[PDB]
Design an enzyme around this catalytic site. Structure first.
Site, mmCIF file in Angstrom:
data_model
loop_
_atom_site.group_PDB
_atom_site.id
_atom_site.type_symbol
_atom_site.label_atom_id
_atom_site.label_comp_id
_atom_site.label_asym_id
_atom_site.label_seq_id
_atom_site.Cartn_x
_atom_site.Cartn_y
_atom_site.Cartn_z
ATOM 1 N N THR A 113 -0.869 12.125 24.632
ATOM 2 C CA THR A 113 -0.895 13.583 24.718
ATOM 3 C C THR A 113 -1.109 14.099 26.135
ATOM 4 O OG1 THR A 113 -1.463 14.033 22.410
ATOM 5 C CG2 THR A 113 -2.376 15.527 24.069
ATOM 6 N N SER B 113 -6.947 10.941 29.939
ATOM 7 C CA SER B 113 -8.091 11.801 29.665
ATOM 8 C C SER B 113 -9.130 11.090 28.808
ATOM 9 C CB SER B 113 -7.642 13.086 28.980
ATOM 10 O OG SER B 113 -7.222 12.811 27.653
ATOM 11 N N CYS B 114 -9.216 9.765 28.941
ATOM 12 C CA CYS B 114 -10.117 8.914 28.171
ATOM 13 C C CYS B 114 -10.920 8.079 29.159
ATOM 14 C CB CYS B 114 -9.314 8.025 27.208
ATOM 15 S SG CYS B 114 -10.131 6.559 26.493
ATOM 16 N N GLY C 109 -11.931 12.830 26.706
ATOM 17 C CA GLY C 109 -12.882 12.172 25.828
ATOM 18 C C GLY C 109 -13.694 11.123 26.569
ATOM 19 N N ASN D 219 -14.993 3.213 23.882
ATOM 20 C CA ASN D 219 -14.721 4.590 24.245
ATOM 21 C C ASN D 219 -14.967 5.505 23.046
ATOM 22 O OD1 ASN D 219 -12.291 3.408 23.042
ATOM 23 N ND2 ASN D 219 -11.317 5.369 23.545
ATOM 24 N N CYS E 119 -12.963 6.611 20.808
ATOM 25 C CA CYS E 119 -12.250 6.226 19.594
ATOM 26 C C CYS E 119 -12.355 4.736 19.276
ATOM 27 C CB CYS E 119 -10.779 6.653 19.715
ATOM 28 S SG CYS E 119 -10.597 8.430 20.045
ATOM 29 N N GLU F 255 -11.357 1.851 20.725
ATOM 30 C CA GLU F 255 -10.294 0.873 20.932
ATOM 31 C C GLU F 255 -10.290 0.256 22.327
ATOM 32 O OE1 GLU F 255 -9.726 4.075 21.347
ATOM 33 O OE2 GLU F 255 -7.919 4.492 22.520
ATOM 34 N N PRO G 139 -5.936 5.790 18.022
ATOM 35 C CA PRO G 139 -5.459 6.746 17.026
ATOM 36 C C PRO G 139 -4.295 7.524 17.613
ATOM 37 C CG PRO G 139 -7.843 6.959 17.417
ATOM 38 C CD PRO G 139 -7.255 6.176 18.551
ATOM 39 N N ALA H 177 -2.868 10.460 16.024
ATOM 40 C CA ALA H 177 -2.714 11.612 15.142
ATOM 41 C C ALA H 177 -1.551 12.490 15.572
ATOM 42 C CB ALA H 177 -4.010 12.420 15.111
ATOM 43 N N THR H 178 -1.529 12.881 16.843
ATOM 44 C CA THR H 178 -0.541 13.851 17.290
ATOM 45 C C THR H 178 0.808 13.205 17.592
ATOM 46 O OG1 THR H 178 -2.326 15.196 18.185
ATOM 47 C CG2 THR H 178 -0.097 15.682 18.908
ATOM 48 N N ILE H 179 0.825 12.086 18.319
ATOM 49 C CA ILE H 179 2.119 11.545 18.721
ATOM 50 C C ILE H 179 2.831 10.912 17.532
ATOM 51 C CG2 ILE H 179 1.441 11.286 21.126
ATOM 52 C CD1 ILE H 179 1.071 8.297 20.569
#
Ligand SMILES: Nc1ncnc2c1ncn2[C@H]1C[C@H](O)[C@@H](COP(=O)(O)OP(=O)(O)OP(=O)(O)O)O1
Ligand SMILES: Nc1ncnc2c1ncn2[C@H]1C[C@H](O)[C@@H](COP(=O)(O)OP(=O)(O)OP(=O)(O)O)O1
Ligand SMILES: Nc1ncnc2c1ncn2[C@H]1C[C@H](O)[C@@H](COP(=O)(O)OP(=O)(O)OP(=O)(O)O)O1
Ligand SMILES: Nc1ncnc2c1ncn2[C@H]1C[C@H](O)[C@@H](COP(=O)(O)OP(=O)(O)OP(=O)(O)O)O1
Ligand SMILES: Nc1ncnc2c1ncn2[C@H]1C[C@H](O)[C@@H](COP(=O)(O)OP(=O)(O)OP(=O)(O)O)O1
Ligand SMILES: Nc1ncnc2c1ncn2[C@H]1C[C@H](O)[C@@H](COP(=O)(O)OP(=O)(O)OP(=O)(O)O)O1
Ligand SMILES: [Mg+2]
Ligand SMILES: [Mg+2]
Lengths: 874, 860
Positions: free
Chosen positions: B314, B329-330, B358, B535, B537, B539, B721, B723-725
């Site tokens: 994203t 952004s992680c 995040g 992190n 999420c 992973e 994850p 979700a969006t892509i």
């Protein structure tokens, strides 16, 4: 568990029949592919379970239920589960098969219903019900009325009758199912009254031996036969004055118009029958048109042309164009008639005269008289008393004697001027709690307020309290003369040369006055200086207070108890196609004033000083009623410049005619004794009184409209030659006579467009007949509208479907801003020589709002205010 | 929006509650005299319910029919239990319908002028939207849309009507999702091309020529408004305009296109002027901006993105090709045990979250309740008072997950930070939490041993130690404390703490369970640092220190596009991976770094995280149930091939760009690949406590030899994850099993039911798709397990998340972790709520060599 089948038989309770039924409905909306579906089967057995459970939950060890009781619970289960398509097709199919059963039942029907009920006669004999006469009275009752269904009433009645009914309660059954229809159509009120009249005719005529029964149009010939029979029996039992036999009853019997019985509303006829019609042994033997003829005759027993004037008075009364006051209606035509029951007195500052005033209170109240008492002259707490060598306790211990006299004789209003040293105790006399020695819970109170006090309120000035025994000349002074003399006494007290006094802030006493008016309803607020400066009788006396109802402004003294002789014009009967019938108004006013002038001569006087003042000055008080209803007919909302304009011009018209009528009586009977010197002699009419009032008080403290739509110069000339009455006009409450004539109260805005009378069997709602009539034109009169009006207690505000023009026109008393009622009263007062009873309605209820309101009332030249109706909810 | 009611004879009026109130009231009055007082109140509730239903169905307004209202009125009465009134409402309504049966359109252009509806153009956009799709009926769309139009309807509202009509048909035939998207494209073309001025409107066929014309106009207008990096002007925009493939717009699902339009396409004054293929070309150009052959690589990246074979993260999609692009952004940080560094760490959180980033925070080094502080002469109150500052910072900057090791003396307070009740000073409701669990702790659980809690200030070396060195040192401190030599400590039973951890995960959802030792032992970068946490999420496993904030540079492979004829297409997969790894390596160099510790770690070690998505859909295309050994083998072998190509790609980039700065000493240089480090973990922990399949199918030896010569990236793979892509490309999320085969998307555009398109296709192929089947699926909320008509093979294939035994998910995840150098976000689904079932589930996760677990989705 078993079930009552459609027809008798009883069978075991089987879930399968429910399961099959619901499954049929699922397979109807869906296909056959739903035949084998775990979903359907799981759902049905779930719905079947909560149905079977419901019957188990309300009953113990088995029971019996109706087949339709199960169908209803099946629909309920489907519906609560949100099965909209299956539930509705279940309903539809079930109704289709109910239609076939209903129709098939009607095809196999057999007809038996016969013969008829036998009506039981008074003597005890049975008689078959007359169907021909039953159709006649209901048709003559629905005559001339719209949206009324005679056959509908006859059917609904015929239901609730049994073999052996008495003709007594067969009429009441007709009435019962006639007033139940006024909720959906007000014109049934007229129908209800016309049906009740059948009992009255039988009652009265049977008593008089004229006829044992009669219909309406049969009265065209029977009213003339009944009148002489009525007078003969009336005088025999000393219920009617024997002088009425000196009339030509044959000629009066022909003047009676039987069609005017059709004018009565149910409430109007009930009112007369219950309390006004003459009776003996509980039997009313006075019919409505004969009642009006008795009053007319009683008012004409001293006319030169007895019959001509009696007919003129009967036509005015029976048409509802004008209505005499309650005491005239009740006593005219009877022995020693009390035609006026309203009096004003002034109490002197000596113990003998105090108890002479208590004695007069008792005598004047012996027959339901209302009293205003001016107690200002009586010296206050702390005043010296020679002979006793002690100090007075003030007026309140004497007012307690008044209070207990009113209780003993079965109302009275005490007035006190605002500088009186007992004023502070006076304001609290009607508190619910506190020392009972300082309370008068059965006596009304009113403030007698000089302009100077209000001036000190407006200017945040001071105010000095005096005992009248130290300032005995103040109470009789008014205007500039009072203010000069009062300031002289004020300066004296500030230099220690008048010991007994109290200095307060005017605003503080004003605030106390308004808080007591709000908390207790008393004392009322009345204004001394406009009552005196505008009184036509300033040359021969002083107005010392107003009356019980605060619309009368007459002089009183040692030898004069003022008497209020009252009647009211019905404005509704003078509104034609949306306009005021100027021409018809003059004719009614001319006859009204004459009838009121007659009241003075016929009235039987108990106390000699009441006869003295009535004969000397001949005041009358012609008022108005139906004002709110007259606004409806013009589609004018009370809260508008158009209503204020109509209030101004309608009073100016009545005033012109009333004053002109008094000139005609002066030409025929001579002017009253004390005419010489009155304002009328000086060519100062009420409109001119307003101008001088503004000069005296000053424009800084009063502002009133001075517009005129007539030419008064010619009438201002004829008045100076003589009039018959010192005072002509006064707007008094009209509770009973407005109900008799079926119109709104005096100048009151509608208190509520809906009320729920409940005093016999059930409760019957009554809705503003004008509101329903307008809602029909809009097409907005239907069951849902009725259900909304009840929910809102008649308020048409905040119901979306009614357009804004009707929301304004049918605004209620508490949703019309008070400024409209004050400004309207202000312009009516320009033409009235006395005053007007003015109730004020204030929602929001704050001391701030009361201040601005009663400042405005004074600022606008009002003479009196009456009850305060306050709500703190808004 | 405006709610408009269509009368029975076409005309249109505003929506008015009063009409419903009057109608319902007449039915109440038809039944009943004194108890009629309650009518006004109950009717107003029923009207409010009906009005709320249309608001919830049309939040932005729209049109509606009388008979639709009538049905909602009936349903409202029926649910309230008003059986008498409801049946009377039905009977009357049918009576009037019986009575009734017996006894042109212009458009309002934006400029206010009127013009008749262009039927010809309406036929073409519908016909072109149905191209190439089965079971789609253009005539039905036109007729059903016309019923919803009216004279004077706004121009835009015509397209809205088309989209709404097509969208309701998605539940009957999933291909209508593509129709809905293609119809929506018409307003995007008019909005974009009119803004750029290349055309006032355009059809899909016309985009074959207009895309090339619109690309230069887009770059110029965008550069002028500082919404596009001005360097994109340096590309040969003519050559890139010819490379755009207009037919790829026909790929979009409604949800995917709606997601891009609402949140990604560049806009100016509320106007999106970036069309879908131009969007993908901007991103491609943004990622190729530093490349030698700019146009060839941009075209290469455009073909990868626009085909949906791979989708960047994203932030990359958002910001590639713009000024100072935040392409990642992680982040991961480690918090030191000093107040200045604690608030430096909090400062970093705010700065890194400034643009939705995040964060994973390691808080284990901060000393616990009771520790001595030489700053004063008092005792520390622990980490939670500072986590409260972290919590308030997440709120104020709005995303943060705090990690704490299991021996930390504040752990018991940490376990309860997300309880709904209790002292709020002991709660952090806006902050996520995760356990950093050493293997020794789980060994104690398996053996019902004890466990000692310490403050890190007395044992400051434990956090950085791992494996057997941690166990030796921990047991030294353990014995040292048992006889008074270690002041501040607490002994507990490992089983009791483990039960509390699982109880809090079930009751509050937190903290998550991650495993410190697998993350460190298998990290390629053991020679230069230590993994202190995962992190946000769970992973990513990257090193952190006071000089290094780790950065996750992420993208995912679309597995759906790599299954042809029911088999994995390795040739296409190899092409996709190689290009994807390059794009990710480019992200490192292009990314704008606002924090220097983040730039330092990315440039030194160049980690990337290539993931996957569409796994569940890929199983459908192979008719493999997720709950089967065939699914385990596909999970194993598909990740094996991906990892092979990704490691090979990173060798290729090392040949071209140079190995990363810290390559020497890494596991890669030692020839220790992920499959090798998995075997090392078995030896280190002991076979009693771990068991993982070690099967191979590819020839790894030559690649192992090549890796030692140099690789470009310290880390390569991570399953995030998606979700969006995944919604953009229209595939199932990452590795998750289908949550439900049928659900109601409740968007601001309205509501429409979505049904598993693969399930619908298989049911159609067997003649089992019909209205009855639809209502069976709605009744069972998508589950097919109780529908007798559905054959058993399809019952297994279309089991959902709570119907697939959790062991299947854990085993598949275990096989993937054989080949992955970082980790994978693993949600677990447990239908039987019990502490016992939670115990066996997460013991098995540890026992099968998993590095991390994520959300627990549970039912009772
Ligand atoms: N044994 C029973 N116990 C309880 N409810 C029953 C039973 N039998 C019928 N019902 C209820 C369920 C349904 O609503 C309805 C049954 O309709 P139906 O099967 O047509 O029986 P019925 O009483 O109308 O006779 P018929 O066979 O002529 O229809 O009555
Ligand atoms: N085609 C259908 N559509 C909807 N509901 C149905 C249908 N068939 C049956 N039902 C429902 C409603 C009925 O109450 C019941 C069927 O019983 P049935 O005996 O046919 O009707 P009934 O009991 O109301 O009348 P009756 O027995 O006098 O004909 O199940
Ligand atoms: N015993 C008493 N108790 C209470 N009030 C009294 C009593 N005697 C007199 N008063 C009051 C009543 C009057 O308000 C006031 C004047 O009383 P009154 O009988 O008229 O005396 P008076 O008029 O002959 O003499 P003066 O008025 O000159 O004092 O005093
Ligand atoms: N403007 C409106 N806004 C909302 N609901 C409406 C509106 N007009 C009608 N309805 C709905 C509410 C009820 O479900 C039903 C009521 O029907 P009704 O009030 O009779 O309208 P109608 O279209 O049938 O016109 P009419 O009956 O006056 O000829 O239709
Ligand atoms: N007497 C009644 N009994 C039951 N429900 C009623 C009744 N009157 C109205 N309703 C309900 C159902 C109706 O659809 C609605 C009012 O609309 P109404 O105009 O009377 O009928 P309708 O809208 O269904 O047909 P139409 O408007 O064409 O006459 O409210
Ligand atoms: N005023 C304080 N309130 C709460 N916690 C504090 C305070 N000062 C320090 N701490 C905590 C933060 C760290 O977890 C720990 C050490 O902090 P700090 O004193 O700044 O480190 P330091 O290295 O300078 O001194 P020390 O010699 O104690 O290690 O104590
Ligand atoms: Mg039946
Ligand atoms: Mg209708």
């Amino acid at each position: 568990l078993r079930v009552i089948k459609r027809n008798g038989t009883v069978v075991p309770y089987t879930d399968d029949k429910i399961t099959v039924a619901i499954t049929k409905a699922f397979l109807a909306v869906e296909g056959g592919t739903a035949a084998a579906s775990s979903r359907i089967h799981d759902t049905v057995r779930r719905l079947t379970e909560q149905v079977t459970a419901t019957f188990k939950r309300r009953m113990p060890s088995g029971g019996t239920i109706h087949i339709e009781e199960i169908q209803d619970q099946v629909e309920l289960a489907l519906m609560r589960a949100g099965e909209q398509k299956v539930a509705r097709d279940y309903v539809i199919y079930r109704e289709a098969r109910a239609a076939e059963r209903k129709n098939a039942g009607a095809a196999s029907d057999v007809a038996q219903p016969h013969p008829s009920i036998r009506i039981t006669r008074a003597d005890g004999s049975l008689s078959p019900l007359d169907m021909g006469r039953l159709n006649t009275i209901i048709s003559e009752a629905c005559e001339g009325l719209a949206e009324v269904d005679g056959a509908l009433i006859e059917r609904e009645t015929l239901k609730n009758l049994y073999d052996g009914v008495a003709e007594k309660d067969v009429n009441t059954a007709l009435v019962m199912t006639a007033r139940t229809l006024v909720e959906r159509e007000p014109n049934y009120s007229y129908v209800t009254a016309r049906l009740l009249m059948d009992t009255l005719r039988a009652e009265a005529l049977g008593f008089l031996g004229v006829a044992e029964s009669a219909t309406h149009h049969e009265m065209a010939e029977l009213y003339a036969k009944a009148l002489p029979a009525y007078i003969e029996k009336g005088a025999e039992f000393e219920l009617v004055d024997a002088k009425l036999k000196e009339f030509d009853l044959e000629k009066l019997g022909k003047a009676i118009d039987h069609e005017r019985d059709q004018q009565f509303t149910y409430l109007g006829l009930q009112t007369l029958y219950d309390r006004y019609f003459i009776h003996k042994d509980g039997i009313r033997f006075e019919l409505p048109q004969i009642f009006f003829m008795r009053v007319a005759m009683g008012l004409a027993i001293e006319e030169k042309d007895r019959e001509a004037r009696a007919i003129e008075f009967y036509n005015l009364l029976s048409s509802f164009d004008y209505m005499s006051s309650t005491p005239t209606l009740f006593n005219a035509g009877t022995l020693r008639p009390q035609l006026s029951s309203c009096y004003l007195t002034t109490v002197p500052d000596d113990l003998s005269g105090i108890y002479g005033a208590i004695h007069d209170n008792a005598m004047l109240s012996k027959f339901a008289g209302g009293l205003g008492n001016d107690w200002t002259p009586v010296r206050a707490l702390g005043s010296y008393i020679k002979g006793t060598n002690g100090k007075s306790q003030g007026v309140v211990p004497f007012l307690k004697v008044v209070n207990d006299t009113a209780v003993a004789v079965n109302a009275v209003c005490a007035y006190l001027e605002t500088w009186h040293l007992d004023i502070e105790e006076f304001l609290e006399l009607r508190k619910n709690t506190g020392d009972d020695r300082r309370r008068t819970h059965d006596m009304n109170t009113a403030n007698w307020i000089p302009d100077l006090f209000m001036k000190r309120v407006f200017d945040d000035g001071s105010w000095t309290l005096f005992s009248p025994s130290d300032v005995p000349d103040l109470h009789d002074l008014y205007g500039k003369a009072f203010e000069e003399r009062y300031e002289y006494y004020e300066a004296l007290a500030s230099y220690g040369k008048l010991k007994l006094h109290k200095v307060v802030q005017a605003k503080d006493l004003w605030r106390k006055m308004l808080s007591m008016l709000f908390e207790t309803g008393h004392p009322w607020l009345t204004f001394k200086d406009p009552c005196n400066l505008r009184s036509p009788q300033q040359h021969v006396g002083v107005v010392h207070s107003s009356n019980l109802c605060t619309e009368i402004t007459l002089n009183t003294n040692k030898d004069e108890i003022a008497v209020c002789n009252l009647g009211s014009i019905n404005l509704v009967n003078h509104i034609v196609d949306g306009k005021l019938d100027t021409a018809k108004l003059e004719k009614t006013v001319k006859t009204a004033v004459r009838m009121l002038d007659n009241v003075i001569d016929i009235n039987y006087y108990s106390v000699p000083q009441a006869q003295n003042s009535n004969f000397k000055h001949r005041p009358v008080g012609l008022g108005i009623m139906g004002f709110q209803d007259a606004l409806y007919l013009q589609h004018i909302p009370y809260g508008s410049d158009a209503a204020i304009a109509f209030a101004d011009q309608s009073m100016e018209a009545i005033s012109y005619y009333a004053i002109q009528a008094s000139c005609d009586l002066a030409d025929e009977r001579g002017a009253y004794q004390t005419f010489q010197g009155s304002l009328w002699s000086q060519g100062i009419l009420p409109i001119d009184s307003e101008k001088k009032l503004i000069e005296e008080r000053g424009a800084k403290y009063i502002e009133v409209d001075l517009s005129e739509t007539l030419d008064w110069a010619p009438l201002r000339e004829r008045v100076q030659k003589g009039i018959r009455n010192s005072n002509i006009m006064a707007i008094a409450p009209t509770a009973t006579i407005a109900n008799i004539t079926g119109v709104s109260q005096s100048i009151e805005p509608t208190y509520q467009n809906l009320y729920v009378k409940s005093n016999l069997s059930g409760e019957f709602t009554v809705i503003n007949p004008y509101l329903v009539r307008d809602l029909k034109a809009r097409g907005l009169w239907d069951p849902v509208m009725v259900n909304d009006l009840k929910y809102y207690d008649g308020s048409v505000q905040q119901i979306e479907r009614i357009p804004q023009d009707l929301k304004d026109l049918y605004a209620t008393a508490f949703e019309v801003e008070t400024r409209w009622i004050v400004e309207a009263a202000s312009r009516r007062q320009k033409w009235i020589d006395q005053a007007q009873s003015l109730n004020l309605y204030i929602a929001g209820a704050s001391g701030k709002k009361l201040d601005v309101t009663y400042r405005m009332a004074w600022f606008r030249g009002l003479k009196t205010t009456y009850y305060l109706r306050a709500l703190a909810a808004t």
